[PDB]
Amino acid sequence: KNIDGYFKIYSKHTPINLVRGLPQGFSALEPLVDLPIGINITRFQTLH
Amino acid sequence: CYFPLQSYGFQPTYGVGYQPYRVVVLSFELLHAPATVCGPKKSTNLVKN
Numbered sequence: 001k002n003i004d005g006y007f008k009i010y011s012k013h014t015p016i017n018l019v020r021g022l023p024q025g026f027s028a029l030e031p032l033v034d035l036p037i038g039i040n041i042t043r044f045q046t047l048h
Numbered sequence: 049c050y051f052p053l054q055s056y057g058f059q060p061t062y063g064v065g066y067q068p069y070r071v072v073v074l075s076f077e078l079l080h081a082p083a084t085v086c087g088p089k090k091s092t093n094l095v096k097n
Binding site for chain 2: 006
């Protein structure tokens with residue numbers, strides 16, 4: 001997300017057992033990095 | 049018609065006034081971007097009780 005030009009990045013990594021969809025459970029995401037960039041982003045893509 | 053670039057003669061034998069000086073010019077500009085670079089801080093001792 002973009003908060004006052006500061007990108008706030010949050011991350012969580014846990015093992016799961018999932019056939020498809022999303023599993024039923026609760027988890028919280030820990031802070032990762034904070035990037036003082038301040039550029040407008042209207043779109044995004046993913047790499048594979 | 050003249051070639052604009054000219055050469056600096058550099059030898060140790062030249063006088064002190066004309067000796068080449070390496071000049072480093074720092075450009076200080078305050079924009080609307082978030083400020084990052086700041087002066088050095090100072091850490092003091094920690095006391096309890």
